[PDB]
Structure formats: structure tokens, C-alpha cells
Design an enzyme around this catalytic site. Structure first.
Site, PDB file in Angstrom:
ATOM      1  N   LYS A 130     -13.129   3.964   1.233  1.00 21.97           N
ATOM      2  CA  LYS A 130     -12.778   4.179   2.629  1.00 21.97           C
ATOM      3  C   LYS A 130     -13.930   4.885   3.340  1.00 21.97           C
ATOM      4  O   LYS A 130     -14.295   6.010   2.978  1.00 21.97           O
ATOM      5  CB  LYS A 130     -11.488   4.993   2.733  1.00 21.97           C
ATOM      6  CG  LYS A 130     -10.271   4.293   2.135  1.00 21.97           C
ATOM      7  CD  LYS A 130      -9.062   5.223   2.059  1.00 21.97           C
ATOM      8  CE  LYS A 130      -8.534   5.580   3.440  1.00 21.97           C
ATOM      9  NZ  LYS A 130      -7.404   6.552   3.359  1.00 21.97           N
ATOM     10  N   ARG A 150       0.839  -1.191   0.000  1.00 23.50           N
ATOM     11  CA  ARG A 150       0.000   0.000   0.000  1.00 23.50           C
ATOM     12  C   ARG A 150       0.877   1.244   0.000  1.00 23.50           C
ATOM     13  O   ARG A 150       1.766   1.382   0.846  1.00 23.50           O
ATOM     14  CB  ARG A 150      -0.928   0.008   1.218  1.00 23.50           C
ATOM     15  CG  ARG A 150      -1.523   1.369   1.546  1.00 23.50           C
ATOM     16  CD  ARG A 150      -2.393   1.301   2.782  1.00 23.50           C
ATOM     17  NE  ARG A 150      -3.092   2.555   3.042  1.00 23.50           N
ATOM     18  CZ  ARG A 150      -2.716   3.452   3.943  1.00 23.50           C
ATOM     19  NH1 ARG A 150      -1.649   3.264   4.703  1.00 23.50           N
ATOM     20  NH2 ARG A 150      -3.426   4.568   4.082  1.00 23.50           N
ATOM     21  N   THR A 194      -5.904   0.230  10.567  1.00 24.86           N
ATOM     22  CA  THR A 194      -5.499   1.283  11.495  1.00 24.86           C
ATOM     23  C   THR A 194      -5.277   0.806  12.926  1.00 24.86           C
ATOM     24  O   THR A 194      -6.208   0.347  13.595  1.00 24.86           O
ATOM     25  CB  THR A 194      -6.520   2.424  11.489  1.00 24.86           C
ATOM     26  OG1 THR A 194      -6.599   2.985  10.172  1.00 24.86           O
ATOM     27  CG2 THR A 194      -6.098   3.510  12.469  1.00 24.86           C
ATOM     28  N   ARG A 201      -8.359  22.482   6.134  1.00 25.48           N
ATOM     29  CA  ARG A 201      -7.159  22.918   6.833  1.00 25.48           C
ATOM     30  C   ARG A 201      -7.337  24.320   7.393  1.00 25.48           C
ATOM     31  O   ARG A 201      -8.103  25.130   6.866  1.00 25.48           O
ATOM     32  CB  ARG A 201      -5.937  22.891   5.911  1.00 25.48           C
ATOM     33  CG  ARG A 201      -5.476  21.496   5.549  1.00 25.48           C
ATOM     34  CD  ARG A 201      -4.910  20.770   6.759  1.00 25.48           C
ATOM     35  NE  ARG A 201      -4.479  19.423   6.409  1.00 25.48           N
ATOM     36  CZ  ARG A 201      -3.734  18.646   7.183  1.00 25.48           C
ATOM     37  NH1 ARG A 201      -3.313  19.052   8.371  1.00 25.48           N
ATOM     38  NH2 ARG A 201      -3.395  17.435   6.751  1.00 25.48           N
TER      39      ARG A 201
END
Ligand SMILES: [Mg+2]
Ligand SMILES: [Mg+2]
Ligand SMILES: [Mg+2]
Ligand code: NA
Ligand code: NA
Ligand code: NA
Lengths: 520, 520, 520
Positions: free
Chosen positions: C259, C62, C317, C109
Site C-alpha cells: 500500500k 477484503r 478508496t 496517535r
């Protein structure tokens, strides 16, 4: 050591393994949970015989109003009650007996052959036969024309439809359709008599819910204080409401059992069930209307949905037919009774076997014996889980008390469940979830007791003592009554364990209190 | 409207469909059924901090006697009781807190490297290393000769056995056995210090069930009035009996939780379980003894069998490790806690996360959040059925009352079950069958209340009122206490329904009476 | 003699009993069914290390495009292929390795604090903080004014909504909303740095499915011949369709793994699953967006529904997070891996553990060891029934063959299923019904072989022999190739039995022929 009550099978994980564990040497219990309904007639209406009917296990006396006058049935009802009350002296061994009125109901009848009630003509396979409504022929029927008394017949059958005559003995097919006649072809032939029954398979018959004779009989049944009514040829919810109407305010507490008898009754069963107090699978008339090989589908379907709703269901007709002339049944007949109990039927019925046959007492005793064996052979654990599954949309408090109490009786193998109820509702909910132990229901309501025989496993006990002022003492009085009845009947003994359901306060609307109590 | 409590998943037919229905938007209830055990240490032993632990959700304070003097632990225990009673002013919001002593246990230790407590030597893969029992070398350990203090070691290991040194960091294979020595080959090398711990994977270690120190610490535990004992390194029933014996009459009511820590303890679990009051899955040491990738097998086997027997089981070690240094856990840790509760663990534990970490309160609060979610996500219907099946050999009466009560609580979605119990037995049996609603157990026995935290779902409520002469008034008093507690703690409001378990008479041995009751 | 492969637990009736039978001494089989996806980075991107990665269990490499240039990632991809092909010498032991591109995706952000990158301010809880889109303050952020780059933010948030800053470190609550600003109250405070990520829990964020960078990177991936894309921040089917559209015609065979990272992704999961080739449970980001205690709910829901559908699902994760710095995981991490495999995850993933940690290879080896154990501890019989139940809406012919083949492999305890496939579809349908034996898929399509690692239990084997003229000979050739691979890797030995799925004729389109075949 062989367990009793098919308890080894009870512990199986699968249906298959359960069946594999059925043990002819596993003894059933004394208590019999399936109510036995007996048709009374010439062979059994004597007070002397009815007494033996009760001792042999009869629970409900069915009066078939297809024949017999109001004076004839009144005398039978009196004898039934005389026989019943002949055991009243000992209220510990007294069995309440219910009275059910089975209506004649709407019918389609043909006319007279050559003006005679006994004349006959032979219909030949393939021949022609015109059905007429012209009353000029109502007393002039013959092999070429046949009159009948259903005037809307052409409105509910179509070309190609079938007409059955005389309990299905003869079948005709509708070739042509006219204003007031039908031209049919003779499929199955035979000898056609006078004033025979006609069945219209598949048709939506628009006959009324009750005939003018039914209305008189229903009023007669109110006068005579019958406990339940078996209403015939119920095809739709409206038919049930109409029977409810006729019974009206004075008969508002007589239970209405709808007899499912034809295609429409099966097809519209859900709404019929919702409106009714109970259901009869009238397999005799059903097997005339629908193909015989399909009757078992309707039986199992109807019993299943009745169990799901917790409404009484009766299996009827020819269960022990051969015992009309013989003192022992065939193997198919013992099978049929046992599978009726395994299906889930609250009551099983006898018709000709007790109304006119030579061995009415043997028919009652046989059904009693088969039911006890079939009751132990049920797969209670699976049955309970699947009923709880079916009703899980309901959070009803009494259902919760019933399910917890039946669950407890499973766990400790309780010998019985004692339920104090006046209306009977709490006892009904316990029977709905199918304990294996008998439910001893103590009521001061005599009718509640008689009507209790419609629910599997409820043993009604009438308490005749005045209501004690102290609630706790009044509860204990009735509980000890059940304790005494159970000991006398041999259901349990000192040291056994029972599940006791009661009301916490006089004002409780249901048995909100449950106890596991040793038998004193 | 999105159902609460994962109740949509609850109605699923299969385990797969239940999992597919888990809904992050289905809020859990307020009550948290899983017990949180907190190891007390430097970071959490102050009264000020202990008060916030109770408020965050701590139910049991764990004293780890691997280190610390009797003086240190005595003061810790004092601060816990001081913090706990700071809320006793409100008998309605008071939360009992249990005290647990975790014994150090028997050990295998190495000697001094080259006479220094701080020296070390490097063992190289494939090199030869001699283990000696000769005390001449007990301070002359080097990379050639290694002394240790377990003198029967040669009687319990064979050629081919593995020896683990320093919490598994180093491993040796026995190549030769001698009378008082073992010739080994280094498998996993590393740096060997002094007085390191030794583990014998697969061996039946005949070390005593308790050490000299342990006997002192258990004496101290009785003197300090501890509620339970976590007994280390339990390998067989006899070990549990020795702990019991050591506790004697004076400690007969202290609960013994056997810690499963090695191969033998797992292989002999059944007998250990039968002898114990409860179990701890000591995953930390177990993973040193057996391959770490197998620990989950033992954890799930052990929890499952404890659920089967109705005996408390604790999941311990590193559940929220990363929170020793961080205020939030990892995803593996959040999942480990939730899966421990889904497994069926009665309690989950915190060691360094509360004993020495930087965020002991956040650790406790995170286990609290996760447990509530995981509790809703259980498949209660299947769990209940399978627990019933597993114990169907038992006909115990309290089990019948508990199963009927849980069953009832499911049917009517009761907001709680209220159990009146002095010993706690009746409540323990309700918890054993795992309702989703909380169990409010009213007792006048403070110890019974503290030990109740060992059982999933039991919220202990100490009744400090005096007994009433009238049994009914005393029952009604304690029932109303449970009502007020539940309303003040948010478990239910007026109009909700609860299950109430009580003794019919003062002399009933258990809660033989069950009621469904609306909250006033 | 202890059974292998948890086959004793496999014979249990209930999940409880299966759980109680899990046996640490029941050895697992050699083959590992769960795919291991390794994030390659500085710690692991050398050819030498990648060679060890493959030997230790890596199936998919990955590349996280969150950082790094096309040149850097192209060189990593090159090293993966060099290492992968260094084993091509022996086509019996060769193992295909897939290449996955994980996109950076869209982000929100903040600006610079007081004109500095390395400069922070403290947001005290309860303070006020104003968010603005006015680029005047884009480099003048401080504890009073905060700039960010999401221009539509005010359109997707309400009063009472929450805003998370710096991976959930800081939580704000919108108290007043303007047209280009929000007045918030600080809930959780902390030190605020520059250019931190923002998360809008519960919001229907309207950022594009792909960013400008994502479009360049996805194009790069097509040029680089990647096998699959991990598409970040998927919130709806349309987002999947956008990624598909970008990959275009030349990338039509690249599999798209969506995802799931926030509330909208979980709530709209069904339409996302239908449109995706596979799913990743991106637990890190998901636990930033949704409360961390709910992540396991989303994981188990998603895995169940992917299994139900037969589409690959990846658990990602922090599975072995501590192994970034330590050579052994925690007990919570071992449990997390096992439970992910018990949940049904086709693949498990390592991120920083392999990309930058001190112990990449130990991490791979630990996942390999855990997966084999957990794969044996599944309840295959119940899982198969429930999958069959969930998919009964399909009468697909290949599905029928797959189910029949898995059933047969259970019955005779087949050591493997051999499937000849060019697209992999037949092997995929077998994989979705979860045999315990490994699936050896023989394919002449190299990309099929690489993508096969997405499906639990498919061991791909690339046939490099030319096509034989006699179809029967070409089938025999590929079947025998599978036999030798199975023997070489220790999946089976002479005399074992395998299920073999083939096409009856070259154009059958699927494996319509199933045989039980002894291993020669
Ligand atoms: Mg009729
Ligand atoms: Mg230890
Ligand atoms: Mg993200
Ligand atoms: Na009642
Ligand atoms: Na008790
Ligand atoms: Na194929």
C-alpha cells in the site's frame, strides 16, 4: 483531379501507405531544392558550355585538384565566373554560382616498374610479393618486390591485414612483418602498373591532414576567392582543424566540407561532423576502402546525422556514370539519384559525367528532373516530426522561428518561404527542418548567396540596392525583390501565399518575425 | 533538480512512458488554463461573497433559470457586475467575468396524485399502470392511471420502450399503445408523487426547442446583456437554429452552448456541434436518460470532437458534489476534475457546490488547484500532432499562424503567447491547438474578453487605453500591457521569452505577424 | 449496424480519433476483466448477503484489520467460504473468491484532551501549539500542550516541516524544535479530539514496517489460509522484505500487495514495486499525506509502472463513496471508476461502500457495469505497442508466447484465450499484455485460481478431475472444460475462435504451444 507534389501520399498515416500513394501522374513543382554540383573539365570548361551548364541547373562548379596546374584551374574559375556574370544584366533571372576546390589530399603511391611509367607486370593469385620501403627500389618495381612512399606503413598494419593496390584492382594480405618491409600474398591478381594508389582498409593511416601540395592549393583557393573546400581523406576532427588552420584568418569564411573516404572516417564521423561545415560521402574512394555492399549503410548513416545536425551533406560519385558515353542513364542510376534525395542529401554531384563525358548537359538535366520528383516524394510530415524529436534538447530561438515557419508552410501549403539574411544563418535553420516549399533567401552578401547552395531548398537572391535608411522600407524592398524573383521563376503567382521571415529591428540577430503574406 | 510542469513526462516517446513519468514533486506553473464556471445562488450571490469567488478563480457566473424570477436573477447579475468592477480600478489586475444564462428548457410533467400536490402512491414491480393524456385525470393520478402533459408521447414511443418518472427513480415498459394512452408495466417501482419529471430514453422527442418560459427568459437574457446561453435539451441542429433565431439580431453576438442531455443529442452530435458555438456535457440529465455507466463514453467522445473543431466544451455536474456539505472533496471527485481536464475540457463547472453549498469558495479553490496540475500532465506533443492531423484538410491562414506559434512556443519553452485581437478569433485558434503556456489576449472589446473564458488557456486583458494614430505605437502599447499583466500576475519575468501575434497593418483580418520576443 | 466492443474506435489511428469514436451504442461484451475487491463488514458479512455479493461480481473479500478481533474476522472469513462453496455444486458456474488481509499498520496517535475521550479544544489559526513526548501530559492534552506516541518524531522533522492531525483536519508548522518537543504554529485550525492520527507529510518516517499487532495479525492470516496481504504504509523495499519475512516459510505463497500511502512511498516506488507481488494505490491516506490535487498524478504513475512490470495494481478508496448513503452514484464517481479502468488498474476496490454502507450490493453492481464499458474503450492496439516497447529488454520465452498469443487474438478477434497453468505464470504474462478477450485459466491449484483475480482479465477455472495418464488426454480434458465454461457463461458459442495455450509435454514448465481453435 490528381493532386500535385505527391500531396495524396503526404497525407498518409504510415510510411508504407505513403509509399503506396506515390503517383507517377502527380506533378512536381517548378522549384528544384537539391543543389547540383558539377565537376568542370575538358568537356565543360568553355565559357559557351558553362553558360548551358547554368541554364541546365548547375549550382556549384567543382575544381578537382587531383590533376591540372594552378594556371589551368585559374582559367576554369575565370570562365565559370564569365559564364556566371553573363546573366548579371537581369538580376531577377541571375543564378549565383559557387566555386569549390577539391583537394588532392594525402596519398600512398607505388614506384616505377622497370624505370618506366607505362610498364606493367602481372601478379598471379596466390603468389608472393614483398613490399619495401628501401628507396633503392623506388624506380625498380617488379612482380616480386613493390616499393611505396608511405614510410610508416608497417606501424599501422598488422599481420593478416590487407593492402589494396590501384583503386582496389589488386588485393594483398600481410603474411609477415619486418623492420622496413612486408611480405604479402596476392589474393586478387591482375596487372600492376607504376605509381598506383594504395589503400589500407581498417588501418589508422597517420599521413598528415594536408600534403605539401594541398597547402599550396589551399592558398591558391584563398587567392581565387573560392566559396568552399572539399577536403580529402578526413579521418578525425584534428584533420579538419588543420585545414581550418591552413585556410587561416583570410579564409575563415570558406566552408570546409570533409570528404569521408575510409573506415576511420566513418567510425569517427561524429567528431568530424562537429568540426566541419559540411560533409561529402565520397562513395568512390569509400567503396575502395570498405566493402562495396556496405557503402549504402555509410551513405544513409552520414546523411541522417547531417540532417539531424542541420549541416550540408553531399552525395557524390558515379550517380549517372553510364551517361559519360550515353545520353540517357540506366535505371539503377535514376534510382540512385532519387534515393539520394529521399535519403536527405542537400546536394548531388557529377564527376566524370560533366568533367570529360560526351553528354555533360544531359547529365545535369537528368539530375535536375529526378531531384524534383524525389523532393515531392519525401514524407515531410514524418521527417519534420523526427527532426524536431532529434533536436528537442535545444531551445534555440531561431530554431523555434524556423520550426514554426516550416510548420505554417505545411498548414497553408505556402508557395515559398522568404528569408532575409546577411550571414545566411536564418535561412539555414529553415532548410534544416525541410519544408517542401522553396526558400527564397535575399542577401546583400554575395558569398552568403554562393554558399547557400549547400543547403537543401535555399534559392539565393542577391540584392544590389543600397541599404534604405528606414528599416521598414529596406525590409519591404528586399521582400518585393523575392516576390518578383518568385513570379519570374514561376514559383508562385498573384494570390498564392508565402511565409516571410524578417528581423523586427535592424539590430535583430536573426529573423525573429514571421508573416503569412499574399503574393501581390 | 526536478523539472517543473511535468516536462520530464513531456519528453516521453509513448503515452505509457509519459504516464509512468508523472511526478508529484514536479510543480505546476502559476497560470491556470481551464475555465471555472460557477452557478450563483443563495450561498454565493452577495457582493461580499462574489468578490471572494473572483479572487478564488471564478471566470463565469451561471444563472440557472430552472428556478427564480427575473427579479431574483436580475439582482444576482447586478451583484456579479458590482463585485467584478470592484477590481476595475487596476486595469492590470482586473479579471473579466462572464455571465451565463442556463435555460430551463422543455419538460414532460405528470399530474397531481389524488388532487394533492403532496400525495403519493406506491408502484409495485410488475404491476400495471396506464398513462393517459385525457385531461380529466390531470388531477386524478393514482397507482392505476397516470396523466402527463406531453400529448405527442404516443407518436414517439413504441411497445417495448421505457418511460422514466421522477429523475429515473421509476421506470415503465410500454406493453400497449392506444390513441391517447399507454399501457405500461412497472419495472422499477417506488413512491410516485405529483408533477414529477418524465424522460423518454431512446425517443426522438418532438417537444419544441424552447418553451414559452424559455422565450421570455431569452428575451430577458438579451436585455440583461448576457455573454452566453446554455441551451437545454438540444437534440438536433434545428433546435440550435431556433435558439439562434429567438436571440435574433439583437443577440447575434451571444454565444450559444448546446447542452447534450439525451440519446438523440448524442447520436446527432456532429450536426449539433456544427450549429453551436460550444457544448456542455450535461452529465446529470444525460445519466438519467442513458445508463449512467455509459456517460463517460459520451463525455470523452464529445470533448474529443469539440477539441477537433476548436469549439468550447464544458464538463458539468457533481464534479465536487461532496463539498456541498464538506470542506474537502472525495478522491473520486479530485480524479474526475483532473480527468476532465486531461480529456480536453475548456471549462469545468460547479452547480450546487457554489449555488447552495456550505463551502463555495473552497470548491472553487479546489478546482483551481486540480486544473493546474492536470494541465501540466497533458501530453502536449502528441495532442498537438493529433489535432494537426485531424484538421489537416483545412489550409486556413489563421490556423497556420496558430500552429506555427504553438509549435514555436513548444520549441523555445515560451512563457506565454500574446495575441492582439478584437473579435478573439486569432486567440481562439491558438487555444484550439493547446499550447501549455497561457494565452494573454489583449482586446478593446469587453464582450470578447468575457467570452474568452470559454476557451482553454486564454487570459483576456481589456485594453482601456485610446487607440494611437501610429499602428506600430498602438500595437506596442497593447503588447506592453500584456507584458505588465504577465509580470504582475507571475506568468513570467524579465528575460523570459514569449510569442507575440499581431496584425501587420490596421486592416489585417487576423494576427498574420508572429514574433519571438524577450520579456523586458 | 453498430460495431460492438468499441471496435470502431479500436481501428483509429490516433488517441484523439479513438476518443472521438467512443460510441454509447456500441455494446460491450458479457465478460468483465477488472477484478472487484469488496471490503466485508457488518453490512455485508452474513452468508446470505455474501452469496449476493458473489452473484453481483465480488472476486476478493477484503478484511480490514484496522478494527475487529481475530474471532470476528475469522467468522467473517468463514462466512465468505461458506457462501463461496454454496456454488461449488456446479463446477462450471463456480467462481473462486479470494481472501485478503489488510493490515492496520503503524500509526502515530495523540493523547487524551483534559483527561477525557469525549472532549475537545479549539485550535485557532495562528495560535502556538507545543508537541511533547513527555508522558506526563499524555492524558492532559489541551489547546496549548499536545502529546503523541511517536518518540523519534523530532528526528524526522525540521523547522518548517508540517504536522497533520486528525486525518488532515488540523495542520501545524514546526517553528522551534527541542529534544523531546516541537513548538508549532497552527495553520489550519479546528476542534481537536483525543487519540487522533498524526501524519508527517514529506518525512522519512522510521516506524517499523510492521507493528506488534501486525505481526499477530499476519500470523493469524497464515493460519487462516489467506490468499494475499495488503500491507499498509509501505515506504521502501525493506518494509516489503520485513512483511515477507514475517509471513515466513509457511506463508511464502501468500502474495504481498504494498500500500503506497505517503511521499516516501511514491518517491521510492520503483524499489517497492520490484520487491512486491502487487501494489495498492491507497488514495485516501495518500491524499491526507500529499496535496489532494496531486493524487491522480501518483495513481496514473503507479498504474503505468505496474502495467509496465506486469504486476497487479489496485485502485482503492472512495470510488463510489456517496453510495454509502445513496442507491446511485454521482457522475464523478462513475467517471472515477471508468478512468481507473482506462488507466490500467487490474482491480478496483470498495471500502465503506460494502463494509458498512446502506447499499453494498448496488455498489458492487455499479462497478461491474462500469468496468465492462471502460474495458472496451481502451486503445488496445496502442497499449500493446507501448507495453511491448517498454519490456523489450526481456527476451523471455513465455513472454514471447504471451505476446504472440495476444497479437493473434487481436488479429482474428478471438473470443477468449484459454491457458492451462498450475502456477498461473503463463496466464499472468498473457494478462500483462492486455488482450480484450477474456483469459480462461484452467488450474488444478485452488490457490492459483483464487490469486488469479489480481490480474486483469484472468477468469480462473479449477480443474477437479484427476490427472489423465495420457498427457494429450489430460490437456484435451482441461481445454474442453474451458470450452464448456465459456459457453455456459456466454463468453463464446460454437463456431467462435479462441487462442489456446498449453504445454507440449508435462514438464515443459510454461505454455510453449499456441493454437487457434474453433469452439466446438
Ligand atoms: Mg581519396
Ligand atoms: Mg434537462
Ligand atoms: Mg494508513
Ligand atoms: Na540571419
Ligand atoms: Na482576430
Ligand atoms: Na504456467
Amino acid at each position: 483531379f490528381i493532386q500535385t507534389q505527391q500531396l495524396h501520399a503526404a497525407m498518409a498515416d504510415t510510411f508504407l501507405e505513403h509509399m503506396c500513394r506515390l503517383d507517377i501522374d502527380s506533378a512536381p513543382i517548378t522549384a528544384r531544392n537539391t543543389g547540383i554540383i558539377c565537376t568542370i573539365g575538358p568537356a565543360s570548361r568553355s565559357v559557351e558550355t558553362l553558360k548551358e551548364m547554368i541554364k541546365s541547373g548547375m549550382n556549384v562548379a567543382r575544381m578537382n585538384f587531383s590533376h591540372g596546374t594552378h594556371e589551368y584551374h585559374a582559367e576554369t574559375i575565370k570562365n565559370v565566373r564569365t559564364a556566371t556574370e553573363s546573366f548579371a544584366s537581369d538580376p531577377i533571372l541571375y543564378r549565383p554560382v559557387a566555386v569549390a576546390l577539391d583537394t588532392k589530399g594525402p596519398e600512398i603511391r607505388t614506384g616505377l616498374i622497370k624505370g618506366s611509367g607505362t610498364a606493367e607486370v602481372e601478379l598471379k593469385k596466390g603468389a608472393t610479393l614483398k613490399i619495401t620501403l628501401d628507396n633503392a627500389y623506388m624506380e625498380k618495381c617488379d612482380e616480386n618486390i613493390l616499393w611505396l612512399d608511405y614510410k610508416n606503413i608497417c606501424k599501422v598494419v598488422d599481420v593478416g591485414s590487407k593492402v589494396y593496390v590501384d583503386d582496389g584492382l589488386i588485393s594483398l594480405q600481410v603474411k609477415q612483418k619486418g623492420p622496413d618491409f612486408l611480405v604479402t600474398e596476392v589474393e586478387n591478381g591482375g596487372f600492376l602498373g607504376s605509381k598506383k594508389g594504395v589503400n589500407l582498409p581498417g588501418a589508422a593511416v597517420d599521413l598528415p591532414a594536408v600534403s605539401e601540395k594541398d597547402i599550396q592549393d589551399l592558398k591558391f583557393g584563398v587567392e581565387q576567392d573560392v566559396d568552399m573546400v572539399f577536403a580529402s581523406f578526413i579521418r578525425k576532427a584534428a584533420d579538419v582543424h588543420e585545414v581550418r588552420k591552413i585556410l587561416g584568418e583570410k579564409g575563415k569564411n570558406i566552408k570546409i566540407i570533409s570528404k569521408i573516404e575510409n573506415h576511420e572516417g566513418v567510425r569517427r564521423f561524429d567528431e568530424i561532423l562537429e568540426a566541419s561545415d559540411g560533409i561529402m560521402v565520397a562513395r568512390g574512394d569509400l567503396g575502395i576502402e570498405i566493402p562495396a555492399e556496405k557503402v549504402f549503410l555509410a551513405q544513409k548513416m552520414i546523411i541522417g546525422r547531417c540532417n539531424r545536425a542541420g549541416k550540408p551533406v553531399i552525395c557524390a560519385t558515379q550517380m549517372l556514370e553510364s551517361m559519360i558515353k550515353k545520353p540517357r542513364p540506366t535505371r539503377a542510376e535514376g534510382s540512385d539519384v532519387a534515393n539520394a534525395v529521399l535519403d536527405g542529401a542537400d546536394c548531388i554531384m557529377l564527376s566524370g559525367e560533366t568533367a570529360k563525358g560526351d553528354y555533360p548537359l544531359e547529365a545535369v538535366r537528368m539530375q535536375h528532373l529526378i531531384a524534383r520528383e524525389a523532393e515531392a516524394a519525401m514524407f515531410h510530415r514524418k521527417l519534420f516530426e523526427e527532426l524536431a524529436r532529434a533536436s528537442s534538447h535545444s531551445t534555440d530561438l531561431m530554431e523555434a522561428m524556423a520550426m514554426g515557419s516550416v510548420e505554417a508552410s505545411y498548414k497553408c501549403l505556402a508557395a515559398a518561404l522568404i528569408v532575409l539574411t546577411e550571414s545566411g544563418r536564418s535561412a539555414h535553420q529553415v532548410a534544416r527542418y525541410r519544408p517542401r516549399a522553396p526558400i527564397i533567401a535575399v542577401t546583400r552578401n554575395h558569398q552568403t548567396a554562393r554558399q547557400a547552395h549547400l543547403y537543401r531548398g535555399i534559392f539565393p537572391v542577391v540584392c544590389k540596392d543600397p541599404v534604405q535608411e528606414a528599416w521598414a522600407e529596406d525590409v519591404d524592398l528586399r521582400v518585393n525583390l523575392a516576390m518578383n524573383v518568385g513570379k519570374a521563376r514561376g514559383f508562385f503567382k498573384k494570390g498564392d501565399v508565402v511565409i516571410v521571415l524578417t528581423g523586427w529591428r535592424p539590430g535583430s540577430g536573426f529573423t525573429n518575425t514571421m508573416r503569412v503574406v499574399p503574393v501581390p
